[PDB]
Design a protein around this nucleic acid. Structure first.
Ligand SMILES: [K+]
Ligand SMILES: [K+]
Ligand SMILES: [K+]
Ligand SMILES: [K+]
Ligand SMILES: [K+]
Ligand SMILES: [K+]
Ligand SMILES: [Mg+2]
Ligand SMILES: [Mg+2]
Ligand SMILES: [Mg+2]
Ligand SMILES: [Mg+2]
Ligand SMILES: [Mg+2]
Ligand SMILES: [Mg+2]
Ligand SMILES: [Mg+2]
Ligand SMILES: [Mg+2]
Ligand SMILES: [Mg+2]
Ligand SMILES: [Mg+2]
Ligand SMILES: [Mg+2]
Ligand SMILES: [Mg+2]
Ligand SMILES: [Mg+2]
Lengths: 62, 119, 113, 79, 126, 67, 124, 98, 105, 55
RNA sequence: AAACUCCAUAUAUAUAAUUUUAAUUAUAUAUAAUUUUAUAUUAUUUAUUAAUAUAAAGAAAGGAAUUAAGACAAAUCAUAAUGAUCCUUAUAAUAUGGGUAAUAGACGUGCUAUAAUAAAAUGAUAAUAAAAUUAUAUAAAAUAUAUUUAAUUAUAUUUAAUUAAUAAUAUAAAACAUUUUAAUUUUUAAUAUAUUUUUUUAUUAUAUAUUAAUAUGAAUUAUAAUCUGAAAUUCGAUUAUAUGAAA
């Protein structure tokens, strides 16, 4: 968003996979048939002087 | 060639089909009733008909509204629409579709046939 | 002080816009007058009754306000108000259906095969 | 085409005043069915913008008022 | 299916202690509902996303039980129900042909009222 | 038209739930990223958790299951 | 351990096998006989009008040269004539192995013991 | 059936010259060998075209008559084969052989 | 005679194949009300069927056209394996296992 | 089909009486359908949700 | 990222008192392949190898989902939401009617057709499916009319069962068999004839026009009736009789 043109900044740190499914017969499941189970993603937007800006966070719990 | 009321027919033509093809106002159902009334068997052909039977067909055809009489009824119904000033009458006068068809495209047949003096 | 519709109506609990308000008003008045319209329609379509009574019912039916007409109810998206491509299984437009479906808001909806 | 068994599309109109006074009946009810009583009376029928004056004849009974008040202008191209 | 199967297993345990012969859970055909959407909000009707919903079904049958005990089963399993599970119960009561004491529409009323109103009575006059 | 209960559950960190984490940043950390992402703000968002070795943790879990 | 138990003839000497092709399914009863066939209680020429469908049913018996050595009572449902005829073909081949397991290799080589996987695919 | 296969084996051309757009210059007409499935297609299409000149309303009758004439030696499609083989003999040097 | 009149008056509610007379009602708002309503109709139908003083409808044959239409919409697997095809002499014969025979004593 | 129509009409009338059904042998349009249709008002009027929500 | 996976397929176990029956099924769990093995040949970087063929074993042959970056400041402010700017008795709100359906030319995408490897009828102990739908319903059988013995098709009357593995929408259709089919004198008919008889042959009649539109085609249009709705005029759907264009 706008924090006169929108700009996007991305912070990435850590693991975005699960190795419990590769080395073992345990099998991964997709939540809602499109989201991996380990991954939990949510987006929240707010309004500033310029306007709407979105915060997109994704956590990987294994 | 068999001549009934001016119309010419090839000998092999089936009577019930030929009558509904050359005579305005007579369709399949009407042609079958005429043949049933005159004692002609369903698939009798024109070359089989005798002169007494050809005259019987002309008699039954002359007691119906066909040819000019039938065409005049359609021409008079269309004229009445124009006389009363109905929307449909104007469409006939302008050579445009009269049954709600779109005109942005197509509408070619209505341009050739729609007219107050419709054939 | 000046309600836009002839009869006072309660507001829908969620998203509101002028078109939703107009549609909701028609829905409430259709329910209040549904029996009346069916009774008049019966009298007008019952061939056992005299023609005069039948024509009187038809005249009364033609004089009812537009907000009593069942055919004027239009399904709209309860989240956006959009009245095109509204799925009746969720009362949402296609776009809001997709957004809600991916957020896990629709009880049993998942992504297809 | 309305089913004949249902009867005419009767709409509230001021016909009594037009029969005792001769005044024109201004109406927007283009769906209204021209009843045999209307014959002789003068109607002003809305076409969306204006009210077209039309007197009803015996060949107009059964038709509808809207049929005599065209709503569009004849098409023309800038040839 | 997961909560459905777990809850079905619990019902069988409740019935056993109540003395109810139970059969099942018999799996019934799963219903699939499908919706196809266009991914874009405005145009681009060439890329379409698919969505679906599956209704899982199970049938548990009860036999040779008195009505009172059957109501206790339904009451208990209702009190301890699981999230997202629905339940329909068809009860079958065998009865005698002849019983003792046994086992007007709104529109019609309004029609009578309307046909008595002056706007209608003024015509019915013969 | 049914009995209703509400169970609030308290989370002590904001990075244990993706929904709570997004709302906090969006609504409370605006003064940190409204003029670009502060060099300190980003650093805090990178030292939240020690960098656990996912492979040994994954293999420890699989050994426990086998045992 | 394994989950496979030797197949054997039933109390009436019948080998029962199931076959599938497209949406069709077939359950056949093969017994030693003189070449009599019944499809859903009807004569083969009645149920299957196409001679190519009849030839497909006979092919497994033609491979082991035992066309006149068995009576077949085939029951089929679903799909159309081709799916049902080939589903019966597949089921007869699977039921003939019980009578002589030494002929499985010849049946496999002829291609009658392989289940055809092709089915109507929703365009993607 | 034996008559049909003999007719197809005698009517189909063994080779056919094809134009290859090799190079910006004019394409080269090089003789190419034909397999048995490709040979049968060429001969069958000739038979069908000859059959469709006959009087019967039924294609089966016209096809039957055409096949009977071909099995008895008379066919107008043997000229087509000779003209395809003449062209190939002319372009024998255009062959590549590697 | 009364059974025949009962079946004639039931019309589509009687299935001759199964002999079941089934009638359902959801006209009223409460199940108890609807149960009485069906019970009352049953008593009325039984009284009319058992009153053969005026008409017994014996000349009128039972009409099953409704049942036939229902049967055409379902699939009928009414074929059984021919009995003269059975070969009981080809069934496997139980073998003698000394261990099982010895483990039972 | 050979059963006289009079006999089949007597059965239809008596059957209709027992089962509280409308017997219209002539076939005149009576409007009975209108009187039997279900009222959809309550379902239609709840489309947008319950208005008595806490605000 | 690949994959792991889920789906399909094959098999096993469990469940169903096999009348909610499709047990030839339903759906939970688990297994299976990214196939394996030997053999000869041909190349090699010749080795603990590839490309082929060959025999053997096996049901084993197909799919899916998602993203990593960047570009078009490509589409959307008309799905909804935000800043700025503008309207505030009007650029906001409601009602009636009209328009969005106009028609010279042009363009995109479809449907139907221009006849004989192809169209039309008929096929009742009812040839043969799958996947869906039915409480803001799905509508059986029957009867009546069009309409004729009946069937078929359409509508009305009536509203059985089922809110559903139960009943209904709904006897799938093509296929296949028989009959018919203009152009076509390749036909039909009258006599005679036959060891082709649903047919052959002979002699007569069977048209003229004709590069052409028929018993192909179904646009256009007249009239009557029906369906939904409060309402079918601009501007809806269906049926019957008649009309029968281009191709
Ligand atoms: K004609
Ligand atoms: K138009
Ligand atoms: K166009
Ligand atoms: K309009
Ligand atoms: K054709
Ligand atoms: K109209
Ligand atoms: Mg609507
Ligand atoms: Mg009922
Ligand atoms: Mg039927
Ligand atoms: Mg059913
Ligand atoms: Mg069964
Ligand atoms: Mg438009
Ligand atoms: Mg046609
Ligand atoms: Mg059948
Ligand atoms: Mg019916
Ligand atoms: Mg059939
Ligand atoms: Mg057909
Ligand atoms: Mg035609
Ligand atoms: Mg032409």
């Amino acid at each position: 968003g706008r924090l006169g043109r929108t700009s996007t900044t991305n912070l990435l740190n850590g693991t975005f996979n699960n190795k419990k499914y590769l080395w073992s017969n345990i099998n991964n499941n997709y939540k809602l048939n499109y989201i991996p189970s380990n991954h939990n993603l949510y987006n929240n937007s707010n309004i500033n002087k310029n306007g709407k800006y979105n915060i997109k966070v994704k956590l990987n719990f294994i | 060639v068999v001549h009934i009321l001016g119309k010419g027919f090839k000998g092999k033509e089936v009577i019930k089909i030929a009558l509904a093809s050359k005579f305005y106002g007579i369709g399949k159902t009407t042609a079958e009733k005429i043949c049933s009334k005159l004692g002609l068997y369903p698939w009798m052909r024109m070359h089989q008909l005798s002169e007494p039977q050809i005259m019987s067909i002309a008699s039954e055809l002359s007691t119906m509204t066909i040819e000019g009489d039938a065409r005049a009824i359609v021409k008079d119904n269309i004229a009445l629409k124009r006389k009363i000033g109905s929307y449909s009458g104007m469409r006939h006068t302008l050579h445009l579709p009269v049954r709600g068809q779109h005109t942005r495209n197509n509408a070619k047949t209505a341009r050739k046939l729609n007219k107050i003096d419709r054939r | 002080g000046n309600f836009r519709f002839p009869i006072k109506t309660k507001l829908p609990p969620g998203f509101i816009n002028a078109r939703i308000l107009r549609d909701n008003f028609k829905r409430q008045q259709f329910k209040e007058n549904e029996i009346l319209v069916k009774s008049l329609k019966f009298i007008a379509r019952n061939m056992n009754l005299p023609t005069k009574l039948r024509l009187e019912a038809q005249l009364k039916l033609n004089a009812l306000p537009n907000y009593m007409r069942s055919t004027q109810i239009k399904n709209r998206c309860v989240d956006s108000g959009h009245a095109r491509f509204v799925l009746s299984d969720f009362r949402l437009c296609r776009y809001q259906f997709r957004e809600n479906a991916l957020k896990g808001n629709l009880p049993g909806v998942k992504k297809g095969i | 085409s309305r089913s004949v068994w249902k009867g005419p599309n009767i709409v509230p109109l001021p016909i009594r005043e037009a029969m005792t006074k001769g005044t024109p009946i201004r109406t927007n009810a283009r769906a209204a069915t021209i009843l045999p009583q209307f014959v002789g009376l003068k109607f002003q029928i809305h076409n969306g913008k204006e009210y077209v004056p039309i007197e009803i004849s015996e060949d107009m009974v059964g038709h509808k008022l809207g049929e005599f008040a065209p709503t569009r202008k004849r098409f023309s191209y800038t040839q | 299916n997961e909560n459905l199967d777990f809850y079905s297993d619990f019902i069988l345990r409740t019935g056993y202690y109540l003395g109810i012969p139970l059969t099942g859970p018999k799996p019934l055909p799963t219903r699939r509902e499908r919706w196809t959407v266009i991914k874009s909000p405005f145009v681009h009707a060439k890329s379409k996303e698919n969505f679906e919903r599956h209704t899982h079904k199970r049938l548990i049958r009860a036999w040779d039980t008195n009505p009172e005990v059957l109501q206790m089963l339904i009451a208990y399993i209702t009190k301890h129900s699981m999230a997202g599970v629905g339940m329909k119960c068809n009860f079958f009561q065998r009865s005698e042909i002849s019983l003792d004491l046994g086992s007007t529409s709104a529109v019609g009323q309004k029609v009578l009222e309307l046909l008595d109103s002056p706007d209608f009575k003024k015509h019915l006059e013969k | 038209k049914k009995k209703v209960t509400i169970e609030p559950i308290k989370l002590s960190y904001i990075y244990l739930n993706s929904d709570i984490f997004s709302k906090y940043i969006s609504l409370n950390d605006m003064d940190k990223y409204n003029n670009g992402i502060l060099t300190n703000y980003q650093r805090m968002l990178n030292n939240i958790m020690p960098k656990l070795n996912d492979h040994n943790i994954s293999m420890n879990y699989i050994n426990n299951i086998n045992n | 351990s394994n989950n496979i138990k030797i197949k054997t003839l039933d109390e009436f000497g019948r080998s029962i096998a199931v076959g599938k092709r497209k949406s069709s399914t077939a359950k056949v009863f093969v017994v030693r006989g003189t070449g009599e066939i019944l499809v859903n209680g009807r004569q083969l020429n009645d149920y299957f009008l196409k001679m190519k469908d009849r030839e497909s049913i006979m092919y497994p018996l033609q491979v082991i040269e035992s066309v006149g050595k068995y009576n077949i009572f085939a029951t089929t449902s679903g799909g159309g004539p081709t799916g049902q005829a080939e589903s019966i073909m597949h089921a007869i081949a699977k039921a003939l192995v019980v009578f002589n397991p030494l002929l499985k290799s010849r049946l496999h080589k002829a291609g009658v013991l392989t289940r055809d996987y092709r089915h109507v695919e929703r365009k993607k | 059936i034996q008559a049909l296969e003999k007719s197809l084996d005698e009517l189909a051309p063994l080779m056919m010259t094809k134009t290859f757009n090799t190079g910006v210059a004019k394409a080269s007409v090089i003789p190419v060998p034909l397999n048995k499935r490709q040979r049968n297609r060429i001969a069958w299409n000739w038979i069908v075209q000859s059959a469709n000149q006959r009087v019967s309303s039924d294609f089966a009758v016209r096809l039957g008559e055409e096949l009977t004439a071909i099995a008895k030696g008379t066919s107008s499609a043997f000229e087509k084969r000779d003209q395809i083989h003449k062209t190939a003999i002319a372009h024998r040097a255009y062959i590549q052989l590697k | 005679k009364s059974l025949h009149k009962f079946r004639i008056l039931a019309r589509s509610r009687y299935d001759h194949t199964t002999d079941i007379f089934k009638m359902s009602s959801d006209k009223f708002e409460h199940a108890s009300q609807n149960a009485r309503y069906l019970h009352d109709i049953l008593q009325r139908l039984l009284a009319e069927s058992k009153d053969l003083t005026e008409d017994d409808f014996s000349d009128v044959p039972l009409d099953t056209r409704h049942t036939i239409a229902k049967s055409l919409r379902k699939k009928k697997r009414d074929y059984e394996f021919p009995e003269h095809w059975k070969r009981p002499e080809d069934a496997p014969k139980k073998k003698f296992d000394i261990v099982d025979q010895l483990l039972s004593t | 089909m050979n059963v006289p129509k009079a006999r089949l009409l007597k059965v239809a009338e008596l059957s209709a009486k027992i089962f509280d059904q409308n017997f219209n042998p002539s076939g005149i349009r009576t409007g009975s359908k209108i009187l039997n249709e279900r009222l959809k008002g309550p379902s239609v009027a709840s489309y947008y949700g319950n208005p008595d929500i806490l605000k």
